[PDB]
Amino acid sequence: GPPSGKTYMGWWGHMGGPKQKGITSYAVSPYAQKPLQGIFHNAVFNSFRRFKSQFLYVLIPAGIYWYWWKNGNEYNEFLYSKAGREELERVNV
Amino acid sequence: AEVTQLSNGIVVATEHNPSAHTASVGVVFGSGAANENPYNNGVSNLWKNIFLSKENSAVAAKEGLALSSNISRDFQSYIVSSLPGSTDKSLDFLNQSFIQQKANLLSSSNFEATKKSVLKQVQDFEDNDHPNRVLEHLHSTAFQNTPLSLPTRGTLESLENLVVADLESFANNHFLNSNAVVVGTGNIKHEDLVNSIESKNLSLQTGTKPVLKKKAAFLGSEVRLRDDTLPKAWISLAVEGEPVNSPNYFVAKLAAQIFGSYNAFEPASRLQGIKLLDNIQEYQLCDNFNHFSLSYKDSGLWGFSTATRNVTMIDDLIHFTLKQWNRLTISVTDTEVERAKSLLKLQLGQLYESGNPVNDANLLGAEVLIKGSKLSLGEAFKKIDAITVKDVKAWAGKRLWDQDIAIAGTGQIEGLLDYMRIRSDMSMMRW
Numbered sequence A: 001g002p003p004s005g006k007t008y009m010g011w012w013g014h015m016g017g018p019k020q021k022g023i024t025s026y027a028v029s030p031y032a033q034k035p036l037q038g039i040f041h042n043a044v045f046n047s048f049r050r051f052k053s054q055f056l057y058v059l060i061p062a063g064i065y066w067y068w069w070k071n072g073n074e075y076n077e078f079l080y081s082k083a084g085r086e087e088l089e090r091v092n093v
Numbered sequence B: 001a002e003v004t005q006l007s008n009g010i011v012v013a014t015e016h017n018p019s020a021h022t023a024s025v026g027v028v029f030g031s032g033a034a035n036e037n038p039y040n041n042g043v044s045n046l047w048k049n050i051f052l053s054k055e056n057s058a059v060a061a062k063e064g065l066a067l068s069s070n071i072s073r074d075f076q077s078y079i080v081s082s083l084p085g086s087t088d089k090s091l092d093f094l095n096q097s098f099i100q101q102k103a104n105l106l107s108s109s110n111f112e113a114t115k116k117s118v119l120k121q122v123q124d125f126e127d128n129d130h131p132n133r134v135l136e137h138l139h140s141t142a143f144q145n146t147p148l149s150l151p152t153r154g155t156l157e158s159l160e161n162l163v164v165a166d167l168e169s170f171a172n173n174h175f176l177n178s179n180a181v182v183v184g185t186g187n188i189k190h191e192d193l194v195n196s197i198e199s200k201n202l203s204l205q206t207g208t209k210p211v212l213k214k215k216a217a218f219l220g221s222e223v224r225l226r227d228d229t230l231p232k233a234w235i236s237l238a239v240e241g242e243p244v245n246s247p248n249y250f251v252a253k254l255a256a257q258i259f260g261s262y263n264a265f266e267p268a269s270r271l272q273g274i275k276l277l278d279n280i281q282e283y284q285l286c287d288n289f290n291h292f293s294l295s296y297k298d299s300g301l302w303g304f305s306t307a308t309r310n311v312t313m314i315d316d317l318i319h320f321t322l323k324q325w326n327r328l329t330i331s332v333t334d335t336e337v338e339r340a341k342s343l344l345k346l347q348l349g350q351l352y353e354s355g356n357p358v359n360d361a362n363l364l365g366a367e368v369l370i371k372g373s374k375l376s377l378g379e380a381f382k383k384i385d386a387i388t389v390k391d392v393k394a395w396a397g398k399r400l401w402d403q404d405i406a407i408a409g410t411g412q413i414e415g416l417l418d419y420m421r422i423r424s425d426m427s428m429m430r431w
C-alpha cells in the first residue's frame, strides 16, 4: 500500500486520542434491563430540555422576525385598500 | 484404597497413598470469600497470613513441620505437612492453633505486621498481575452484588479498615465443627488419625451453625479497566456456567477442553487439534488463551481468557473465538468430542493424581464439604466417556447460544468493541 497522509483520527487500537488510564467503565446487558417500560412519566421531567434551556435562543429571533413580518404585511394590506390610496401613491412613485 | 469417611462429631476424611513419603493433616472449612461482605472482604486472606506468620511457622518448623493455607471462594484450608511418622505432631500444632491459641496470634504486633504484609501483597497483585486481576474482575462483574463477586484476596479499602475484632467475628461465625472437615492425605492411615483425634476431648462451639445469606446470580455485563500504558490487552469473557454437582459438570469441562489452551511461543502448542488455531495464527491474533469451566456451589463461569499484543485486531480474536463456540451448538464433530474426552481425562488425572499431599488435602476437604464424599477418577472417566455429540449440542444450545456474557479487560483494550457487538456473536444467522 502507498504512503498516506496523517489525519486526526486513526482506527480501533490506534484512534489517535491521548493515553487513557485510571478510568473504569461498567455496563449491563440490554437483555438484563427493564424492557423500556418507563418511556413517559419517568422521562417527562427531563424532557423540555431543548425547550427551557434553548427556547429563548429560538423564540426571541423568531418573535422578532414574525412581528417584523406581520407589521409589514398589515401595512401592505392598508396601502392597497381604498383608505391607503393616498399613501400608496406617495411611497410608490 | 477407596477413601474412608468417618464421623463421631468431627468429620474425618483421609486418602492413603503408599507411594507418598510425606503426610498432610489439616482442616478445611466450608466458608470462603463468598461468605464475606464488601466491608470485611479480605478477612479470610488475613487469617491465612496470620496462620502462616513467622511466630506460628517457627514453632512448626522446630517440630519439622510445614504450613500451607488456601483461601478459595467456597472454602478455606489450613494444612500441616510432615514425615509419615510425625503425623501426631501435626495434630498437636493444629489443635493448638485452633483451640488453645487465640490472643497469641492476634497480638497487636503480629496482626498489624501481618495486615501491612497482605496490604502490600494485594497492592502488588492489583498493580501487576494482569491476567489474574482480570479474571477476578470477571467474577466481580458477572456476579455483582452477589457473594461470588468478592475477590478472594479482599480489597484494599476493606483490608485497611479491618481490625482484630473482624477476624474474631468471622472465626466465631465460620470456624465451626459443623462447617469443617479434618483431612488426612499422603502416607497415613485413617485409624491412626481418627484415634489421635478421638484421643482429645472438648468441642469449642458445639452445634453452632454458620451464617446464611442470598444466592449467587449471573448478570450479563462488563467492566473495562483500560490502561494504554500497558504492553498488552488482557481479556476474560464468559457465560453462566455450571455449579459443582451439576448434571452437566463434565459436559461443560469437556466443551472447554475442545477449544483448550494455547501458547503461541510453544512449537507443539501451535500444532494442537483445535480448529480455532487455523484462524488465529495467520495474523497472530494473540500470545495465549485458555478456556475454562469454573464451578462453584451456587453457580459457575464458562469462557476464556486471552492476552495479546495485536491491539488492532482484537475484534478478530473475539469474533473467531465466539464463532467457534457457536459450533458447539450446531456442528461440533465426533473427533473433536473424542479428542476432548482423552485430554479431559489427562487433565483430571493430573489434577487428582498429583504427587502432592497438600493438593490432595484441599481437593478432598472441599469435595466432602459439598457432597459429603469425593468422586473417584474411575467414575469420572466413565461419565466422560459416555458424553456424546448430542449432549454437547444440548448443553451449548442452553448455555452458549444467544446467551448473555460477562466481560472484563485491562491494558490496550480500545480495540475491544462494545458489549452488543460481542454479544451478537453468541449466535449465527439462520434461514
Ligand SMILES: CCCCCCCCCCCO[C@@H]1O[C@H](CO)[C@@H](O[C@H]2O[C@H](CO)[C@@H](O)[C@H](O)[C@H]2O)[C@H](O)[C@H]1O
Pocket: B402, B424, B427, B428, B429, B430, B431
Ligand atoms: C431492503 C428491504 C428488505 C427488508 C427485509 C427485512 C429483512 C428481515 C430479516 C429478518 C430475520 O433475519 C433473522 O434475524 C434474526 C435476528 O433478528 C436471526 O437470529 C439469530 O440471532 C438471534 C439473536 O441473537 C438468535 O436468537 C437466533 O437464534 C439467531 O439465529 C435469524 O437467524 C435471521 O434469519
